[PDB]
Amino acid sequence: SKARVYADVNVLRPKEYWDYEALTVQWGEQDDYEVVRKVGRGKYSEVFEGINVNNNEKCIIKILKPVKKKKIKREIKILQNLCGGPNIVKLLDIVRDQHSKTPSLIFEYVNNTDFKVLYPTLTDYDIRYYIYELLKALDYCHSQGIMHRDVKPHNVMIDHELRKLRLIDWGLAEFYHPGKEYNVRVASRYFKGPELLVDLQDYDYSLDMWSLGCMFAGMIFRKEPFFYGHDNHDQLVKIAKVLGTDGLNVYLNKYRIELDPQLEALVGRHSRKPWLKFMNADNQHLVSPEAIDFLDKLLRYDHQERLTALEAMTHPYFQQVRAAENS
Ligand SMILES: Brc1c(Br)c(Br)c2[nH]nnc2c1Br
């Protein structure tokens, strides 16, 4: 399997662009940034809200904990390559300490609304507007030969007050290379594409479109995790119960994959449940014929069949968002 679009972008670019292991970061000054309060974490990092002590501007400080070398360079190089792109979080500086305690990434400030409280307030047009803005980020990173791999509500920061959208946390992002076998342990369970669930390792940018599709279904149908599995195996079962098992079998046959007999039985046999069955009076105002059509073109087993981000932008569902953008 090879990406339908932007498959050879990294080949055409110099080795330095995509060879992140050979990256010699230019460290800034840790003194220029004070850490104020933790909004951060404990996976591969801690995120805080701080200020730039040279202009008093707020910023986001991400401190990398027990996450050794490869990954850090990888995230830094992808961020530098994308800085300036439409709706891509902006890496302002990269600092550390002279003596020991290591890594810290500085970002432009971002101001969120726990997506769980925001999504219910979104109107039909707001969803169209924000998904379209997210589409600009993915088409840009993809055209730059980069896969995000962790698209989910938490990583799509939305400042509704300012109608601003930022795709954050590129810690799981990677450069795309034709035929390369990637790690499938990426994304968050509910947004994992079928490829990752059946171990199809030579995936591509289309993985992000499946994640986007899961978010979209979740937003228009008012069903937060649209595909709510309990584990990686049960995630595939939940997907099969909606898309149907006939399409799953076609996909496996095409890419020559055979499921673990215990997983195959677990998935079983299911008919395709039409998208209209998730519609109700609660989400009615968000559903339309075009919204169902768009979603249908994103949530396809076969990654090669899914709409690319660019093609997604021209779907009729966005025609209004697109027009307003003219002058
Ligand atoms: Br909250 C938050 C914000 Br804001 C940014 Br920016 C992040 N980048 N990586 N992880 C992040 C988290 Br958690």
Side-chain angles (χ1 to χ4, degrees):
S1 179
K2 302 177 178 302
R4 172 211 284 177
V5 295
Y6 305 123
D8 306 305
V9 163
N10 289 315
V11 171
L12 187 63
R13 293 179 183 287
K15 186 186 188 66
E16 69 182 71
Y17 180 74
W18 53 267
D19 177 25
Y20 59 81
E21 296 195 63
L23 169 57
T24 59
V25 190
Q26 297 190 304
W27 311 100
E29 295 303 291
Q30 178 181 61
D31 287 345
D32 293 312
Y33 307 98
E34 282 187 357
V35 179
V36 186
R37 61 187 255 70
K38 177 194 223 75
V39 339
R41 270 161 193 203
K43 282 187 185 179
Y44 304 85
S45 61
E46 272 177 355
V47 188
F48 304 92
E49 184 175 301
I51 66 290
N52 180 157
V53 303
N54 282 57
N55 61 53
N56 277 311
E57 282 288 304
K58 283 187 182 299
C59 60
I60 294 305
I61 303 184
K62 185 177 179 185
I63 310 182
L64 282 299
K65 266 67 174 108
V67 175
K68 301 269 176 116
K69 309 179 183 180
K70 237 132 171 204
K71 308 299 181 57
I72 295 182
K73 293 182 177 181
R74 184 223 256 166
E75 180 176 353
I76 293 178
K77 189 68 181 180
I78 285 172
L79 281 167
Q80 301 180 317
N81 288 354
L82 300 168
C83 206
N87 305 331
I88 302 296
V89 74
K90 180 180 293 293
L91 179 66
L92 298 187
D93 219 322
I94 308 172
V95 301
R96 70 180 184 175
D97 185 5
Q98 308 308 321
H99 301 87
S100 311
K101 285 62 196 280
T102 36
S104 253
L105 301 181
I106 317 295
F107 298 100
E108 63 177 307
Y109 183 63
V110 179
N111 47 354
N112 15 307
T113 275
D114 164 34
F115 72 89
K116 290 179 173 63
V117 179
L118 178 68
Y119 287 14
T121 68
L122 299 180
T123 58
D124 181 18
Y125 186 77
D126 295 335
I127 296 176
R128 303 183 191 233
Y129 175 70
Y130 288 121
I131 292 300
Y132 188 79
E133 284 294 296
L134 172 57
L135 285 168
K136 296 173 169 176
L138 301 177
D139 178 62
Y140 186 73
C141 68
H142 294 173
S143 69
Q144 283 293 295
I146 292 165
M147 302 181 266
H148 183 280
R149 308 199 301 177
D150 195 31
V151 175
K152 62 185 183 178
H154 186 284
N155 288 329
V156 183
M157 287 290 161
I158 299 173
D159 179 332
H160 194 41
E161 177 194 302
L162 300 178
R163 275 179 175 280
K164 180 191 296 187
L165 181 143
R166 291 288 186 286
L167 181 50
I168 59 165
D169 193 350
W170 297 74
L172 282 176
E174 252 297 6
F175 293 80
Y176 176 68
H177 295 282
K180 186 179 177 181
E181 289 179 329
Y182 294 97
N183 180 342
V184 298
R185 249 54 174 184
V186 296
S188 58
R189 188 193 307 161
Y190 316 128
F191 302 91
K192 288 184 182 290
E195 52 269 58
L196 305 183
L197 302 173
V198 309
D199 287 325
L200 188 161
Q201 289 182 276
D202 47 339
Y203 58 76
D204 56 59
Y205 314 108
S206 61
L207 161 67
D208 296 327
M209 295 307 279
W210 169 282
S211 292
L212 172 54
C214 294
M215 278 186 62
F216 187 59
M219 288 169 94
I220 72 172
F221 292 132
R222 288 290 183 64
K223 195 173 179 298
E224 23 291 355
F226 187 72
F227 291 126
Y228 192 50
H230 295 65
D231 54 60
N232 287 325
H233 283 330
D234 190 54
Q235 187 55 39
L236 181 63
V237 178
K238 293 301 172 64
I239 287 169
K241 289 175 179 173
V242 175
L243 297 180
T245 182
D246 286 357
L248 172 55
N249 290 305
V250 171
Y251 176 59
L252 297 172
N253 286 354
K254 177 178 177 185
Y255 294 91
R256 318 97 183 179
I257 303 182
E258 288 191 60
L259 303 175
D260 168 5
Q262 76 109 180
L263 176 57
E264 201 190 74
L266 204 56
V267 169
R269 313 158 187 175
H270 304 278
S271 291
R272 181 187 183 73
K273 171 153 60 177
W275 298 115
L276 304 84
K277 290 184 183 176
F278 298 107
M279 191 174 87
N280 53 46
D282 175 47
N283 53 43
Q284 176 166 189
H285 61 114
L286 307 176
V287 185
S288 61
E290 36 288 310
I292 291 301
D293 183 71
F294 175 55
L295 173 69
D296 184 69
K297 287 168 176 170
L298 291 181
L299 298 189
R300 292 294 176 67
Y301 281 124
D302 193 325
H303 48 289
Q304 290 187 187
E305 271 174 36
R306 301 171 201 157
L307 298 175
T308 47
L310 179 59
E311 174 72 347
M313 294 177 88
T314 59
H315 191 274
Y317 178 70
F318 302 105
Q319 74 91 187
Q320 199 156 65
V321 177
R322 209 181 307 99
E325 198 159 299
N326 299 175
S327 181

PDB file of all heavy atoms in Angstrom, residues 193-214:
ATOM      1  N   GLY A 193      -7.568   3.944  13.415  1.00  0.00           N
ATOM      2  CA  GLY A 193      -8.137   3.472  12.167  1.00  0.00           C
ATOM      3  C   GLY A 193      -8.081   1.951  12.072  1.00  0.00           C
ATOM      4  O   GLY A 193      -7.292   1.322  12.777  1.00  0.00           O
ATOM      5  N   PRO A 194      -8.916   1.326  11.228  1.00  0.00           N
ATOM      6  CA  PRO A 194      -8.913  -0.134  11.085  1.00  0.00           C
ATOM      7  C   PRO A 194      -7.508  -0.669  10.822  1.00  0.00           C
ATOM      8  O   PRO A 194      -7.143  -1.740  11.309  1.00  0.00           O
ATOM      9  CB  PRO A 194      -9.834  -0.366   9.888  1.00  0.00           C
ATOM     10  CG  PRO A 194     -10.799   0.779   9.978  1.00  0.00           C
ATOM     11  CD  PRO A 194      -9.924   1.943  10.343  1.00  0.00           C
ATOM     12  N   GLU A 195      -6.728   0.076  10.040  1.00  0.00           N
ATOM     13  CA  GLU A 195      -5.370  -0.347   9.706  1.00  0.00           C
ATOM     14  C   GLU A 195      -4.544  -0.665  10.948  1.00  0.00           C
ATOM     15  O   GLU A 195      -3.821  -1.658  10.981  1.00  0.00           O
ATOM     16  CB  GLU A 195      -4.656   0.716   8.847  1.00  0.00           C
ATOM     17  CG  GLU A 195      -4.661   2.139   9.407  1.00  0.00           C
ATOM     18  CD  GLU A 195      -5.851   2.969   8.932  1.00  0.00           C
ATOM     19  OE1 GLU A 195      -6.998   2.551   9.178  1.00  0.00           O
ATOM     20  OE2 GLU A 195      -5.636   4.044   8.319  1.00  0.00           O
ATOM     21  N   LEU A 196      -4.670   0.170  11.973  1.00  0.00           N
ATOM     22  CA  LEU A 196      -3.934  -0.021  13.212  1.00  0.00           C
ATOM     23  C   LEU A 196      -4.503  -1.179  14.034  1.00  0.00           C
ATOM     24  O   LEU A 196      -3.790  -1.826  14.791  1.00  0.00           O
ATOM     25  CB  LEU A 196      -3.988   1.256  14.066  1.00  0.00           C
ATOM     26  CG  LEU A 196      -3.540   2.601  13.484  1.00  0.00           C
ATOM     27  CD1 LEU A 196      -3.630   3.672  14.577  1.00  0.00           C
ATOM     28  CD2 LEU A 196      -2.122   2.511  12.954  1.00  0.00           C
ATOM     29  N   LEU A 197      -5.796  -1.426  13.884  1.00  0.00           N
ATOM     30  CA  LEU A 197      -6.457  -2.482  14.630  1.00  0.00           C
ATOM     31  C   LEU A 197      -6.231  -3.889  14.049  1.00  0.00           C
ATOM     32  O   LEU A 197      -6.386  -4.886  14.758  1.00  0.00           O
ATOM     33  CB  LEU A 197      -7.954  -2.157  14.731  1.00  0.00           C
ATOM     34  CG  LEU A 197      -8.257  -0.804  15.401  1.00  0.00           C
ATOM     35  CD1 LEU A 197      -9.755  -0.477  15.305  1.00  0.00           C
ATOM     36  CD2 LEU A 197      -7.818  -0.839  16.857  1.00  0.00           C
ATOM     37  N   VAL A 198      -5.866  -3.972  12.770  1.00  0.00           N
ATOM     38  CA  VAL A 198      -5.606  -5.266  12.146  1.00  0.00           C
ATOM     39  C   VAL A 198      -4.125  -5.409  11.770  1.00  0.00           C
ATOM     40  O   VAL A 198      -3.748  -6.301  11.016  1.00  0.00           O
ATOM     41  CB  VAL A 198      -6.467  -5.468  10.885  1.00  0.00           C
ATOM     42  CG1 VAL A 198      -7.931  -5.182  11.203  1.00  0.00           C
ATOM     43  CG2 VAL A 198      -5.963  -4.577   9.756  1.00  0.00           C
ATOM     44  N   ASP A 199      -3.300  -4.505  12.291  1.00  0.00           N
ATOM     45  CA  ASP A 199      -1.867  -4.514  12.032  1.00  0.00           C
ATOM     46  C   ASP A 199      -1.426  -4.279  10.589  1.00  0.00           C
ATOM     47  O   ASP A 199      -0.508  -4.941  10.098  1.00  0.00           O
ATOM     48  CB  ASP A 199      -1.257  -5.816  12.558  1.00  0.00           C
ATOM     49  CG  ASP A 199      -1.183  -5.847  14.067  1.00  0.00           C
ATOM     50  OD1 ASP A 199      -0.952  -4.781  14.672  1.00  0.00           O
ATOM     51  OD2 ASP A 199      -1.348  -6.935  14.654  1.00  0.00           O
ATOM     52  N   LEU A 200      -2.079  -3.350   9.903  1.00  0.00           N
ATOM     53  CA  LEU A 200      -1.669  -3.021   8.545  1.00  0.00           C
ATOM     54  C   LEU A 200      -0.700  -1.879   8.811  1.00  0.00           C
ATOM     55  O   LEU A 200      -1.104  -0.737   9.024  1.00  0.00           O
ATOM     56  CB  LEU A 200      -2.859  -2.563   7.705  1.00  0.00           C
ATOM     57  CG  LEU A 200      -2.560  -2.377   6.217  1.00  0.00           C
ATOM     58  CD1 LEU A 200      -3.860  -2.391   5.395  1.00  0.00           C
ATOM     59  CD2 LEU A 200      -1.801  -1.081   6.033  1.00  0.00           C
ATOM     60  N   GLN A 201       0.587  -2.213   8.820  1.00  0.00           N
ATOM     61  CA  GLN A 201       1.644  -1.264   9.134  1.00  0.00           C
ATOM     62  C   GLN A 201       2.078  -0.232   8.096  1.00  0.00           C
ATOM     63  O   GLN A 201       2.597   0.814   8.468  1.00  0.00           O
ATOM     64  CB  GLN A 201       2.878  -2.036   9.616  1.00  0.00           C
ATOM     65  CG  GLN A 201       2.708  -2.647  10.996  1.00  0.00           C
ATOM     66  CD  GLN A 201       3.949  -3.370  11.471  1.00  0.00           C
ATOM     67  OE1 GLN A 201       4.171  -4.530  11.138  1.00  0.00           O
ATOM     68  NE2 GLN A 201       4.775  -2.677  12.249  1.00  0.00           N
ATOM     69  N   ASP A 202       1.899  -0.501   6.809  1.00  0.00           N
ATOM     70  CA  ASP A 202       2.319   0.495   5.828  1.00  0.00           C
ATOM     71  C   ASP A 202       1.174   1.455   5.504  1.00  0.00           C
ATOM     72  O   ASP A 202       0.731   1.554   4.364  1.00  0.00           O
ATOM     73  CB  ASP A 202       2.844  -0.194   4.562  1.00  0.00           C
ATOM     74  CG  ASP A 202       1.937  -1.298   4.089  1.00  0.00           C
ATOM     75  OD1 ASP A 202       1.144  -1.802   4.909  1.00  0.00           O
ATOM     76  OD2 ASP A 202       2.027  -1.671   2.901  1.00  0.00           O
ATOM     77  N   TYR A 203       0.709   2.158   6.538  1.00  0.00           N
ATOM     78  CA  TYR A 203      -0.381   3.122   6.414  1.00  0.00           C
ATOM     79  C   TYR A 203       0.153   4.499   6.017  1.00  0.00           C
ATOM     80  O   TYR A 203       1.361   4.661   5.810  1.00  0.00           O
ATOM     81  CB  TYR A 203      -1.164   3.193   7.732  1.00  0.00           C
ATOM     82  CG  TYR A 203      -0.356   3.559   8.969  1.00  0.00           C
ATOM     83  CD1 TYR A 203       0.042   4.879   9.206  1.00  0.00           C
ATOM     84  CD2 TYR A 203      -0.048   2.595   9.934  1.00  0.00           C
ATOM     85  CE1 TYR A 203       0.717   5.230  10.374  1.00  0.00           C
ATOM     86  CE2 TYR A 203       0.621   2.932  11.101  1.00  0.00           C
ATOM     87  CZ  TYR A 203       0.998   4.251  11.319  1.00  0.00           C
ATOM     88  OH  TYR A 203       1.620   4.596  12.495  1.00  0.00           O
ATOM     89  N   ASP A 204      -0.733   5.485   5.904  1.00  0.00           N
ATOM     90  CA  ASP A 204      -0.308   6.820   5.499  1.00  0.00           C
ATOM     91  C   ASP A 204      -1.124   7.956   6.093  1.00  0.00           C
ATOM     92  O   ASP A 204      -1.750   7.809   7.146  1.00  0.00           O
ATOM     93  CB  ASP A 204      -0.300   6.937   3.963  1.00  0.00           C
ATOM     94  CG  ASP A 204      -1.640   6.586   3.331  1.00  0.00           C
ATOM     95  OD1 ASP A 204      -2.658   7.235   3.659  1.00  0.00           O
ATOM     96  OD2 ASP A 204      -1.674   5.661   2.489  1.00  0.00           O
ATOM     97  N   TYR A 205      -1.101   9.094   5.408  1.00  0.00           N
ATOM     98  CA  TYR A 205      -1.822  10.272   5.850  1.00  0.00           C
ATOM     99  C   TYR A 205      -3.301   9.967   6.052  1.00  0.00           C
ATOM    100  O   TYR A 205      -3.943  10.569   6.910  1.00  0.00           O
ATOM    101  CB  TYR A 205      -1.702  11.390   4.816  1.00  0.00           C
ATOM    102  CG  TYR A 205      -0.310  11.618   4.281  1.00  0.00           C
ATOM    103  CD1 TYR A 205       0.016  11.252   2.972  1.00  0.00           C
ATOM    104  CD2 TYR A 205       0.668  12.242   5.060  1.00  0.00           C
ATOM    105  CE1 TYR A 205       1.282  11.508   2.450  1.00  0.00           C
ATOM    106  CE2 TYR A 205       1.939  12.509   4.543  1.00  0.00           C
ATOM    107  CZ  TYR A 205       2.235  12.140   3.238  1.00  0.00           C
ATOM    108  OH  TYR A 205       3.471  12.423   2.709  1.00  0.00           O
ATOM    109  N   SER A 206      -3.841   9.043   5.258  1.00  0.00           N
ATOM    110  CA  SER A 206      -5.259   8.696   5.351  1.00  0.00           C
ATOM    111  C   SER A 206      -5.689   8.253   6.748  1.00  0.00           C
ATOM    112  O   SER A 206      -6.887   8.234   7.059  1.00  0.00           O
ATOM    113  CB  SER A 206      -5.632   7.623   4.321  1.00  0.00           C
ATOM    114  OG  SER A 206      -4.906   6.423   4.520  1.00  0.00           O
ATOM    115  N   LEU A 207      -4.720   7.897   7.588  1.00  0.00           N
ATOM    116  CA  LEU A 207      -5.025   7.501   8.961  1.00  0.00           C
ATOM    117  C   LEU A 207      -5.666   8.691   9.680  1.00  0.00           C
ATOM    118  O   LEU A 207      -6.643   8.526  10.410  1.00  0.00           O
ATOM    119  CB  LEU A 207      -3.750   7.073   9.707  1.00  0.00           C
ATOM    120  CG  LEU A 207      -3.780   7.040  11.244  1.00  0.00           C
ATOM    121  CD1 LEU A 207      -4.717   5.948  11.748  1.00  0.00           C
ATOM    122  CD2 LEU A 207      -2.373   6.800  11.773  1.00  0.00           C
ATOM    123  N   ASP A 208      -5.120   9.890   9.469  1.00  0.00           N
ATOM    124  CA  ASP A 208      -5.664  11.087  10.124  1.00  0.00           C
ATOM    125  C   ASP A 208      -7.094  11.390   9.690  1.00  0.00           C
ATOM    126  O   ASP A 208      -7.870  11.971  10.450  1.00  0.00           O
ATOM    127  CB  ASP A 208      -4.796  12.317   9.849  1.00  0.00           C
ATOM    128  CG  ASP A 208      -3.396  12.186  10.429  1.00  0.00           C
ATOM    129  OD1 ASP A 208      -3.243  11.541  11.492  1.00  0.00           O
ATOM    130  OD2 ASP A 208      -2.455  12.735   9.821  1.00  0.00           O
ATOM    131  N   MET A 209      -7.445  10.993   8.475  1.00  0.00           N
ATOM    132  CA  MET A 209      -8.794  11.233   7.971  1.00  0.00           C
ATOM    133  C   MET A 209      -9.811  10.320   8.647  1.00  0.00           C
ATOM    134  O   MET A 209     -10.987  10.669   8.750  1.00  0.00           O
ATOM    135  CB  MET A 209      -8.840  11.056   6.449  1.00  0.00           C
ATOM    136  CG  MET A 209      -8.011  12.098   5.703  1.00  0.00           C
ATOM    137  SD  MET A 209      -8.429  13.808   6.164  1.00  0.00           S
ATOM    138  CE  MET A 209      -9.877  14.090   5.181  1.00  0.00           C
ATOM    139  N   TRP A 210      -9.367   9.149   9.110  1.00  0.00           N
ATOM    140  CA  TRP A 210     -10.284   8.254   9.801  1.00  0.00           C
ATOM    141  C   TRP A 210     -10.522   8.834  11.183  1.00  0.00           C
ATOM    142  O   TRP A 210     -11.650   8.837  11.677  1.00  0.00           O
ATOM    143  CB  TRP A 210      -9.724   6.839   9.934  1.00  0.00           C
ATOM    144  CG  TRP A 210     -10.553   5.995  10.868  1.00  0.00           C
ATOM    145  CD1 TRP A 210     -10.529   6.029  12.236  1.00  0.00           C
ATOM    146  CD2 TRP A 210     -11.600   5.084  10.510  1.00  0.00           C
ATOM    147  NE1 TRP A 210     -11.500   5.205  12.750  1.00  0.00           N
ATOM    148  CE2 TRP A 210     -12.171   4.608  11.716  1.00  0.00           C
ATOM    149  CE3 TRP A 210     -12.110   4.616   9.291  1.00  0.00           C
ATOM    150  CZ2 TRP A 210     -13.233   3.695  11.739  1.00  0.00           C
ATOM    151  CZ3 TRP A 210     -13.177   3.699   9.313  1.00  0.00           C
ATOM    152  CH2 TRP A 210     -13.720   3.251  10.530  1.00  0.00           C
ATOM    153  N   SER A 211      -9.455   9.326  11.809  1.00  0.00           N
ATOM    154  CA  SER A 211      -9.585   9.918  13.129  1.00  0.00           C
ATOM    155  C   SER A 211     -10.526  11.122  13.042  1.00  0.00           C
ATOM    156  O   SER A 211     -11.396  11.283  13.885  1.00  0.00           O
ATOM    157  CB  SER A 211      -8.218  10.356  13.661  1.00  0.00           C
ATOM    158  OG  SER A 211      -7.403   9.231  13.921  1.00  0.00           O
ATOM    159  N   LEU A 212     -10.338  11.960  12.021  1.00  0.00           N
ATOM    160  CA  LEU A 212     -11.184  13.131  11.816  1.00  0.00           C
ATOM    161  C   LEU A 212     -12.631  12.666  11.663  1.00  0.00           C
ATOM    162  O   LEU A 212     -13.537  13.243  12.241  1.00  0.00           O
ATOM    163  CB  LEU A 212     -10.754  13.886  10.561  1.00  0.00           C
ATOM    164  CG  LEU A 212     -11.679  15.028  10.118  1.00  0.00           C
ATOM    165  CD1 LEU A 212     -11.881  15.993  11.271  1.00  0.00           C
ATOM    166  CD2 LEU A 212     -11.072  15.754   8.940  1.00  0.00           C
ATOM    167  N   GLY A 213     -12.833  11.613  10.882  1.00  0.00           N
ATOM    168  CA  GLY A 213     -14.170  11.085  10.690  1.00  0.00           C
ATOM    169  C   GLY A 213     -14.826  10.654  11.992  1.00  0.00           C
ATOM    170  O   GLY A 213     -16.033  10.841  12.172  1.00  0.00           O
ATOM    171  N   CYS A 214     -14.049  10.072  12.903  1.00  0.00           N
ATOM    172  CA  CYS A 214     -14.594   9.632  14.189  1.00  0.00           C
ATOM    173  C   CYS A 214     -15.011  10.850  15.008  1.00  0.00           C
ATOM    174  O   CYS A 214     -16.036  10.833  15.688  1.00  0.00           O
ATOM    175  CB  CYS A 214     -13.562   8.802  14.969  1.00  0.00           C
ATOM    176  SG  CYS A 214     -13.116   7.203  14.216  1.00  0.00           S
TER     177      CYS A 214
END
